[PDB]
């Protein structure tokens, strides 16, 4: 788990998972490259004629030891000539104020040594290291918010990181948002980017309120207006914790560092109850609860609305198929999914868990291959089909628009009365 001078600007220098894996796991540095063999060909400004040529020497460890590279923070003239003679240069793994002549390549970037969360550190130089690593791990341990706030103080890469995130919507091609809707967003891709068969209409169905690996929220909520012209690759829909094109994690709170009658010491959290009433840090949990109609020996696990020794009120949230209605208010212990086993029948009702009460968000009934689907599942399929037919008919509408437009243009060129053409239906 030790750190070697060989790792100088090589890998994640502060990033380290805790626990038994302490030191067992590292991560890639920011701006160092990789040799075909898997060695750190760390980019470095080839200091050509002492001037740090734009030539980026993606340098390996032996080459690193084989070259004298000065610090990226070193002051140099406009011509790239170092201001000082004894330039602080990392030479053969030994960094020292080496002569201006001694310089071989130049360090690529200040963040090159740093990793991602490492480059995210604000004013890290004026700070210490241990709590830095702690907050670094915490940044991984951060939970998703409900409303986003750009960290007012930036290190720059936050927008870059968000771009790297990709959970948000980016422009496949450039254009203006042709049709903006809550679920389906159509962007008029410019003809320049439009391929010959391509419509030039960009559709991006945004993510919205999805359960994560931690059963956490996922919403790539829209972040643009209809018809707004944009360049290809531009961010479109505000992803979960992705806002204003920047990695949105913190909530810039005006605070003071002073104790308050023992309510604040030992890192106690002093909180304005207004924020609570404002719910400035509220959240949601979407824990998937799946019920399986297991084919059991005396008959399959009969997930059905008919449950003996049960009350009708307990069946309120469940649909006529026993399906907890989309959004149905459930209770801890309540019978969310009427299921049965043979006794005649032993009620196997997949009740919503004790202490689990709330709105029944969705019911993904995946019947076994060879097992029919309920009207609820049929309806879910119908809704998916409606959405798919909507997108498909949008594409086909653009296509038929082009076709009928060409037809009408040919008709006008052929003297067919555009007045009578317009008066007649398009068909």
């Amino acid at each position: 788990r030790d750190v070697h001078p060989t790792h100088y600007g090589r890998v994640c220098p502060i990033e380290t998972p805790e626990g038994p894996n302490i030191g067992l796991i590292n991560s890639l540095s920011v701006y160092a490259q990789t040799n075909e063999y898997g060695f750190l060909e760390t980019p470095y400004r080839k200091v050509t004629d002492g001037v740090v040529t734009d030539e980026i020497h993606y340098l390996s460890a032996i080459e690193e030891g084989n070259y004298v590279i000065a610090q990226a923070n070193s002051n140099l003239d406009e011509e790239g000539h170092f201001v000082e003679d004894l330039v602080t240069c990392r030479s053969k793994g030994e960094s020292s104020l080496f002569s201006r002549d001694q310089v071989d390549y130049m360090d690529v970037s200040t963040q090159q040594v740093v990793s991602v969360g490492a480059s995210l550190i604000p004013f890290l130089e004026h700070d210490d290291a241990n709590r830095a690593l702690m907050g670094a791990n915490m940044q991984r341990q951060a939970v998703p918010t409900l409303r986003a706030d750009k960290p007012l103080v930036g290190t720059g890469m936050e927008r870059a990181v968000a771009v790297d995130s990709g959970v948000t919507a980016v422009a496949k091609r450039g254009g203006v948002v042709q049709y903006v809707d809550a679920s389906r967003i159509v962007i008029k891709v410019n003809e320049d980017e439009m391929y010959p068969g391509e419509a030039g209409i960009d559709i991006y169905n945004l993510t919205k309120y999805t359960r994560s690996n931690q059963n956490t929220c996922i919403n790539q909520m829209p972040c643009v207006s209809l018809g707004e012209p944009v360049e290809r690759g531009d961010v479109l829909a505000d992803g979960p914790s992705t806002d204003l094109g920047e990695l949105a994690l913190g909530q810039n709170m005006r605070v003071a560092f002073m104790p308050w009658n023992g309510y604040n010491f030992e890192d106690s959290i002093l909180v304005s109850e207004r924020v609570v009433q404002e719910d400035r840090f509220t959240t949601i949990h979407i824990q998937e609860l799946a019920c399986v109609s297991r084919d059991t020996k005396l008959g399959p696990e009969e997930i059905t609305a008919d449950i003996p020794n049960v009350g009708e009120a307990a069946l309120s949230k469940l649909d006529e198929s026993g399906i907890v209605y989309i959004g149905a208010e459930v209770t801890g212990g309540d019978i969310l999914v009427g299921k049965v086993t043979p006794k005649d029948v032993k009620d196997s009702s997949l009740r919503v868990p004790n202490g689990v009460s709330g709105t029944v968000i969705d019911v993904q009934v995946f019947t076994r291959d060879g097992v029919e689907k309920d009207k609820r599942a049929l309806e879910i399929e119908e809704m998916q089909l409606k959405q798919a037919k909507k997108d498909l008919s949008e594409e086909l509408q653009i296509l038929e628009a082009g076709l009928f437009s060409r037809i009408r243009a040919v008709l006008v060129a052929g003297g067919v009365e555009a007045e009578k053409l317009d008066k007649l239906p398009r068909d």
Binding site: A142, G250, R254
Partner: protein
Amino acid sequence: DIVLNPLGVPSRMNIGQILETHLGMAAKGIGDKINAMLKQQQEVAKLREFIQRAYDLGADVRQKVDLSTFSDEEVMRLAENLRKGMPIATPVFDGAKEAEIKELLKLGDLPTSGQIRLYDGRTGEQFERPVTVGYMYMLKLNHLVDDKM
């Protein structure tokens, strides 16, 4: 909104919190002057001058932008985004200088030290010393109490 025991400062030696609070206060004040001109419905030229000088604040900063190039409609949209405050960038080993924070607070019309004489509301009396108070972004972990219960 929040308050912290200043004891852990020399303990954790993480003066980055102090820098963060000071910069947050300065930038909040700058964006506050901006939003004041906005509520004042001042000249888009005047608002432009303020916003530009703010972006133009700093010396030898790698970034250089011109709001004149930004359309007047674009200037308006940019200010509208910047209504809540003035977001700034300061990369690792490229953070703002102390004098830079001082200038930002000056444009923020905020105290130079960042320590304010905020009277305690419960006490009903002025704080005995100027209290370092400022804006900073915090985070909450997936360590919900409901899980711990």
